[PDB]
Design an enzyme around this catalytic site. Structure first.
Site, short mmCIF file in Angstrom:
data_model
loop_
_atom_site.label_atom_id
_atom_site.label_comp_id
_atom_site.label_asym_id
_atom_site.label_seq_id
_atom_site.Cartn_x
_atom_site.Cartn_y
_atom_site.Cartn_z
N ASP A 155 0.85 -1.19 0.00
CA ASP A 155 0.00 0.00 0.00
C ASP A 155 0.89 1.24 0.00
O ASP A 155 1.60 1.50 0.97
CB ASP A 155 -0.94 -0.01 1.20
CG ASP A 155 -2.15 0.89 1.00
OD1 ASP A 155 -2.67 0.94 -0.13
OD2 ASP A 155 -2.57 1.54 1.98
N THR A 156 0.84 2.00 -1.09
CA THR A 156 1.63 3.21 -1.23
C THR A 156 0.94 4.45 -0.67
O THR A 156 1.53 5.53 -0.68
CB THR A 156 1.99 3.45 -2.70
OG1 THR A 156 0.79 3.69 -3.44
CG2 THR A 156 2.70 2.24 -3.28
#
Ligand SMILES: Nc1ncnc2c1ncn2[C@@H]1O[C@H](COP(=O)(O)OP(=O)(O)O)[C@@H](O)[C@H]1O
Lengths: 214, 546, 71
Positions: free
Chosen positions: A169-170
C-alpha cells in the site's frame, strides 16, 4: 547534522480522526507523549486502548526509519510464506538501494546491506488474512523522500508478480501519516490485533519514529 | 487494461482442464458467477484429485486472483498480471542491481566474477544477464535461457542508460582479480564490498591471504636479498630511505611529480629489483623505450603514451651513453611535460589526445645523464638513487675489490632467477611495500628532488650562491664598489666582461664550465651602450663590503 | 546452524524442486531448484562440459578438432 539529535519521545494519537484544533492545543485525550517504558506500561494497564503512532512537527525534526505495510486477503502455508517473504524483501531492498543511488546519491551497497541486516516483522491474528508492517532499523530518511519513492514503489507493485509485492500500500506515504501501534486494538469492538515475533522482543524495534543511529 | 477476451484466454490456458461455464462469463459478472471445471485431470494449481468445490476470480491492483471456495489450504493462489512486458520488467530488475554502468568514454562496464569487466567489441551485457539469471525469481530463468530474449533485454538495458559515472577516483586502493586491498589499514575487501570502488584495472592475479603473512622463510630470504643489495649502514641511510620511498610510491594511484634515476656501474641488482616489482604488482608495471626522452610527442601517433594511460609504474631501461657520437640529449621539455596530470598524445588511428598520469617513472642507467638545456625548472623534477654493491664470481674477486666504484663485493649467486619468475616472493614483497607505504606516504604522498647530485647541475647551483643581483640597496656603499672599480653608468652597478672573466677564472677552472659560463653570458647579456658590455650582477665573495 | 537436528524434506511443485527443513521451517532456509528448459541450452552445457573449446586472452577461441588445438 543532527548528531546529538536522536528521537526518543513517542508522540501518540489515542483516537482516529482527531480534530485539528484539539491537536494544536495538545488535548490530553486524543494527543499524548510517552517514553518507551511509559508507553509499554500504559499499554499493559489498558489492553482495550486504541493508539496510533505519528509525528508531531515535520518542519523541525524530519528523521524516521523506513516503514511499509502489506495486506493480502488469503492464507498460505509456511514454506511458501518464507519463500515469498524472502523474495519480497530482496526485491524491495534492491529497489530502495537503486533509488538511493540514482536520486539520493548515496551508496547502493551500504544501503542494501543496512536494509538486509536488521528488519522487524509482525503478524495478524486473522485466520484468513495475512497483514504485517515492516520497519527497518538501520535505514533513515525523511518523509518527502518516501513520498517521492512512492511512485517507484507503486510501479514495483504493479510490475511484480509475488502476491505480497502486489499488496504493498503506497497510500501510507502521505503528509501527517499515522501507523497503528503493534498489539493495540484497531477498533473499540474489534479483537483483531497484531502479535509479536520471536526475533525481537522490544517495542523499541517496532516504532518507525524511534531514531537512534549506531 | 486489456481486452476481456485476452484475460479469458489467459485464465483458460492457466487451467489445463476446460471450463463448462465458458458461455455465461460476461464483462459485468465475471467476479460473481462460480465456474465449474471438468476434473478429468488434476488442476494446474494443486494436483490433488477432482476438487469438490468451484473456484472464483477477483480483481485487485490491476491483477486477477484465483481462489477456491472452502478450505484455503486445499488449493494454491494464482495471480495474473494485467499488462507490462515481462522482458521489460526483467530488464528493470537487472538494471536495478547496479551491475552495469556507462562511463564518460562512451563504453559500458559490467560487474562479473567480482571484477569490473570492460570491453568495446564484445557483448558483455549478455554474459552479465546469463550470470545474473540465478538471483532472479524462477519464473524469469526460463525466459533468460533463450538468446533472442537476452538480446531484447540487452536492448532495453541500453535504452535505459543515459548518464555517465566517473571511474578510478580512489588513489589509495589496490585492485586484484578477486577483491580490493585498502592501503590504509591493510585489510582486504572481497565480494560485493570491492564493487563500491569503480576500479577498471586489476593486478591480473588473484589475491591469497595465506601467503600474505609477515613471518615466513621466504620473507627472511627476501630481507637478506634486500640487505645485500642495499646495506643498512649509516652512509646509505638517506639512499636506502629514498629507495624505500620510491618503491612504495608505486602503489598510489595519484599523480607523481618527480623522476627517479637508478644509477649504478654494472651487475648491481637493478634488474633484480625491477623483476621483483614486476612480480609484485603484476600488469600495472609497464616497460617502455627511450624515445619519449629523445623525441617529441605532439606530431604523429604515439602508441607508447596511449599504453601509458592509467598505469601505476613505468620503467625505461638501457639508456645509451650520451658522451659518444650520435648522442640525442634528453629533452627537458619532455621531462616538464611528463610530470603533469594529463599528457597529450594520440594513438594510432584515433582522436583522443588526453591521458591520465598515475605512473611513477623510473629510469635505469649505467652512465651519467646529459640534457640539452638546464634551468631551475628541471632541478625540481629529478631524483637519483646510487647503487654501490657488486655481485661477482670469486674468479674476479680481486678484479672488483681494486675498483673504486664498487663499495662492497659479494658472491654472485646463480640462485633466484627462475624463482623470481616463479613468483616465489610475490606476496612477500607486497607486505614490505605496504609497510613502507604506511611508514612514509599515508599523511601526504609527495616526492622530493635531489639537486645535489648530477654534477652537471652543480655549476648552476653554485652561481646563485656565488653571485647576487645588484639593486638600489647597494647604493649606500658606493665607496666600496669604487674600491672594486665598478661604475654607476645608467644607475646600475656595471661589470665589464673582461673583469667578469678575470674574476671567475681564479675561482672556476672554466673549460667544462666555459660552455655554461658563455650561456650565462648570452642569456643575461646587457649592452647599456655599443661598447659597455656590463652585467647586472654582484660577486658576493669579494664585494662583501670591501 | 548446528547439525540440522530435524531431517530435511524434498517436494515437487509446478515443475520446481523445493528443499525445506521438517519440524520448524523457521529454523532453516528453503531452497529452490529448477527443471530442464531448452534442449539447445542442455546441448550447449553438455558440449562445454568436455572442455573442447577454450577462450584465450586475445579474445579468440580455440577448439579441439582432429586431435589438435586449432585456433
Ligand atoms: N643478494 C643477492 N643474492 C644473490 N644474487 C644476487 C644478489 N644481488 C645480485 N645478485 C645477482 O647479480 C646479478 C645482477 O644482475 P642485474 O640485476 O642485471 O645487475 P645490473 O642491472 O646492475 O646489470 C643478478 O643476476 C643476480 O642473480
Amino acid at each position: 547534522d543532527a548528531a546529538i539529535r536522536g528521537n526518543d519521545v513517542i508522540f501518540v494519537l489515542k483516537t482516529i480522526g482527531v480534530p485539528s484544533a484539539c491537536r494544536q492545543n495538545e488535548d490530553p485525550r486524543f494527543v499524548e507523549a510517552f517514553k518507551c517504558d511509559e508507553l509499554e506500561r500504559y499499554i499493559d494497564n489498558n489492553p482495550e486502548c486504541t493508539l496510533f503512532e505519528s509525528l508531531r512537527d515535520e518542519e523541525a525534526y524530519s528523521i524516521v526509519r523506513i516503514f511499509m505495510d502489506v495486506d493480502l486477503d488469503a492464507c498460505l502455508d509456511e514454506i511458501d510464506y518464507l519463500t515469498a517473504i524472502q523474495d519480497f524483501i530482496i526485491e524491495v531492498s534492491n529497489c530502495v538501494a537503486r533509488f538511493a543511488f540514482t536520486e539520493c546519491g548515496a551508496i547502493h551497497e551500504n544501503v542494501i546491506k543496512s536494509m538486509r541486516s536488521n528488519f522487524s516483522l509482525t503478524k495478524s491474528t486473522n485466520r484468513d488474512k495475512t497483514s504485517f508492517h515492516i520497519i527497518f532499523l538501520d535505514t533513515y530518511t525523511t518523509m518527502d523522500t518516501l513520498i517521492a519513492m512512492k511512485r517507484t514503489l507503486l510501479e514495483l507493485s504493479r510490475s511484480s508478480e509475488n502476491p505480497l509485492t502486489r499488496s504493498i500500500d503506497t497510500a501510507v506515504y502521505r503528509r501527517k501519516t499515522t501507523l497503528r501501534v503493534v498489539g493495540t486494538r484497531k477498533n473499540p469492538n474489534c479483537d483483531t490485533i497484531h502479535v509479536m515475533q520471536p526475533p525481537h522482543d522490544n517495542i523499541e524495534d517496532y516504532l518507525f519514529t524511534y531514531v537512534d543511529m549506531n | 487494461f486489456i481486452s476481456f477476451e485476452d484475460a479469458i484466454k489467459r485464465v483458460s490456458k492457466i487451467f489445463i482442464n476446460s471450463i463448462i461455464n465458458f458461455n455465461d462469463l460476461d464483462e459485468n459478472n465475471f467476479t460473481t458467477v462460480p465456474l465449474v471445471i471438468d476434473y478429468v485431470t488434476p488442476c494446474a494449481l494443486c494436483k490433488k484429485r477432482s476438487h469438490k468445490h468451484p473456484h472464483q476470480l477477483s480483481l485487485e491492483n490491476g491483477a486477477i486472483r484465483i481462489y477456491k471456495t472452502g478450505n484455503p489450504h486445499s488449493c494454491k493462489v494464482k495471480i495474473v498480471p494485467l499488462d507490462g512486458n515481462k522482458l521489460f520488467n526483467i530488464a528493470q530488475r537487472i538494471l536495478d542491481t547496479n551491475s552495469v554502468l556507462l562511463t564518460e568514454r562512451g563504453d559500458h562496464i559490467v560487474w562479473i566474477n567480482n571484477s569490473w569487466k570492460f570491453n568495446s567489441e564484445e557483448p558483455l551485457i549478455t554474459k552479465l544477464i546469463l550470470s545474473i539469471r540465478h538471483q532472479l525469481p524462477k519464473e524469469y530463468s526460463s525466459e533468460l535461457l533463450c538468446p533472442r530474449k537476452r538480446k531484447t533485454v540487452e536492448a532495453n538495458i541500453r535504452d535505459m542508460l543515459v548518464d555517465s559515472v566517473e571511474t578510478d577516483t580512489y588513489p589509495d586502493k589496490l585492485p586484484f582479480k578477486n577483491g580490493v586491498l585498502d592501503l590504509v589499514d591493510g585489510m582486504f575487501y572481497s565480494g560485493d564490498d570491492a564493487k563500491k570502488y569503480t576500479c577498471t584495472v586489476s593486478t591480473g592475479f588473484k589475491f591469497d591471504d595465506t601467503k600474505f603473512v609477515e613471518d615466513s622463510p621466504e620473507m627472511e630470504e627476501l630481507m637478506n636479498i634486500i640487505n645485500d643489495i642495499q646495506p643498512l649502514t649509516d652512509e646509505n641511510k638517506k639512499n636506502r630511505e629514498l629507495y624505500e620511498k620510491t618503491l612504495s610510491s608505486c602503489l598510489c594511484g595519484a599523480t607523481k611529480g618527480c623522476l627517479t634515476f637508478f644509477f649504478g656501474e654494472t651487475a648491481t641488482g637493478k634488474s633484480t629489483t625491477k623483476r621483483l616489482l614486476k612480480s609484485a604488482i603484476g600488469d600495472l608495471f609497464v616497460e617502455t623505450g627511450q624515445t619519449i626522452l629523445t623525441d617529441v610527442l605532439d606530431k604523429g601517433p604515439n602508441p607508447f603514451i596511449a599504453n601509458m594511460h592509467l598505469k601505476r609504474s613505468v620503467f625505461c631501461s638501457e639508456l645509451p651513453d650520451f658522451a659518444c657520437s650520435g648522442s640525442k640529449k634528453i629533452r627537458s621539455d619532455n621531462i616538464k611535460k611528463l610530470t603533469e596530470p594529463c599528457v597529450i598524445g594520440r594513438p594510432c588511428f584515433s582522436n583522443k589526445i588526453n591521458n591520465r598520469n598515475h605512473a611513477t617513472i623510473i629510469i635505469d642507467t649505467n652512465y651519467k645523464p646529459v640534457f640539452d638545456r638546464i634551468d631551475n625548472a628541471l632541478m625540481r623534477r629529478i631524483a637519483v638513487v646510487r647503487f654501490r654493491t657488486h655481485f661477482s664470481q670469486p674468479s674476479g674477486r680481486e678484479a672488483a675489490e681494486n675498483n673504486d666504484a664498487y663499495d662492497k663485493v659479494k658472491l654472485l649467486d646463480e640462485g633466484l632467477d627462475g624463482k623470481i619468475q616463479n613468483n616465489r616472493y610475490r606476496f612477500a614483497f607486497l607486505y614490505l611495500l605496504v609497510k613502507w607505504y604506511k611508514k612514509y606516504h599515508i599523511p601526504i604522498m609527495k616526492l622530493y628532488p635531489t639537486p645535489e647530485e648530477i654534477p652537471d647541475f652543480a655549476f648552476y647551483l653554485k652561481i646563485g650562491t656565488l653571485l647576487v643581483s645588484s639593486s638600489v640597496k647597494h647604493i649606500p656603499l658606493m665607496t666600496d664598489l669604487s674600491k672594486k672599480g665598478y661604475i654607476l653608468y645608467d644607475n646600475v652597478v656595471t661589470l665589464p666582461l673582461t673583469t667578469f672573466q678575470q674574476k671567475i677564472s681564479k675561482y672556476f677552472n672554466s673549460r667544462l664550465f666555459g660552455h655554461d659560463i658563455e650561456s650565462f653570458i648570452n642569456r643575461h647579456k646587457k649592452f647599456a651602450n655599443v661598447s659597455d658590455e656590463y652585467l647586472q650582477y654582484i660577486f658576493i665573495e669579494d664585494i662583501s663590503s670591501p
